[PDB]
Amino acid sequence: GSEYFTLQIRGRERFEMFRELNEALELKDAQAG
Amino acid sequence: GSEYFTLQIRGRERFEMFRELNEALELKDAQAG
Amino acid sequence: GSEYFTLQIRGRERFEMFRELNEALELKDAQAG
Amino acid sequence: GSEYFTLQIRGRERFEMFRELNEALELKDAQAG
Numbered sequence: 001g002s003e004y005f006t007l008q009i010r011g012r013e014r015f016e017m018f019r020e021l022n023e024a025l026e027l028k029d030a031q032a033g
Numbered sequence: 034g035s036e037y038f039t040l041q042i043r044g045r046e047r048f049e050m051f052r053e054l055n056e057a058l059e060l061k062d063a064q065a066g
Numbered sequence: 067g068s069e070y071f072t073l074q075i076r077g078r079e080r081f082e083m084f085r086e087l088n089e090a091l092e093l094k095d096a097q098a099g
Numbered sequence: 100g101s102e103y104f105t106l107q108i109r110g111r112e113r114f115e116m117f118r119e120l121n122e123a124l125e126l127k128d129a130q131a132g
Contacts, residue, residue, distance in 0.1 A: 005048035007040045007055060014058065015038040017083055018051060022040060024123035025047060031126070050116060057090035060097070071114035073106040073121060080124065081104040084117060088108060095109075 009015040042048045075081040108114045 005042045005045070007042060007048065007051055008037050009040050009055060010035045010037055010059065010062070012036060012038070015040065018040050018055070021120055021123070022042060022047075022051070024120070024127065026043065027126050028119075028123040029043075054087055054090075057087070057094045060094050061090045070107045070109055071111065073108060073114070073117055075104050075106050075121060076101045076125070076128065078102060078104070080121075081106065084106050084121070088106060088113075088117065091113065092109065 007018075009018055040051065042051055073084075075084060106117060108117055
């Protein structure tokens with residue numbers, strides 16, 4: 001989409017694992033000045 | 034059925050990457066029925 | 067290496083999480099697909 | 100310190116995917132630094 005993409009994840013543990021990865025990538029995005 | 038959750042993802046490359054991982058895990062789920 | 071590439075992972079939980087993803091990718095390739 | 104493990108990965112694009120995910124998680128690593 002123009003502001004984000006969506007993905008449907010089956011299962012709470014699985015979702016929490018993918019959210020940890022996604023938040024970490026967003027932390028990586030912040031490293032550039 | 035199972036509980037599903039929405040992962041909101043920034044960037045097309047990042048989306049394609051997560052979709053690849055999620056599809057592989059779903060094919061693993063499919064083994065058992 | 068010529069048969070695989072290796073990555074050092076810090077922490078048991080982190081390793082287990084990546085191993086599950088990696089094995090799922092391999093199972094998808096082996097079942098072709 | 101921590102305990103370290105080795106992830107064995109097939110394919111160089113798959114290796115670079117895991118490398119990137121791991122590097123992002125490593126921005127979280129610290130003793131309250």
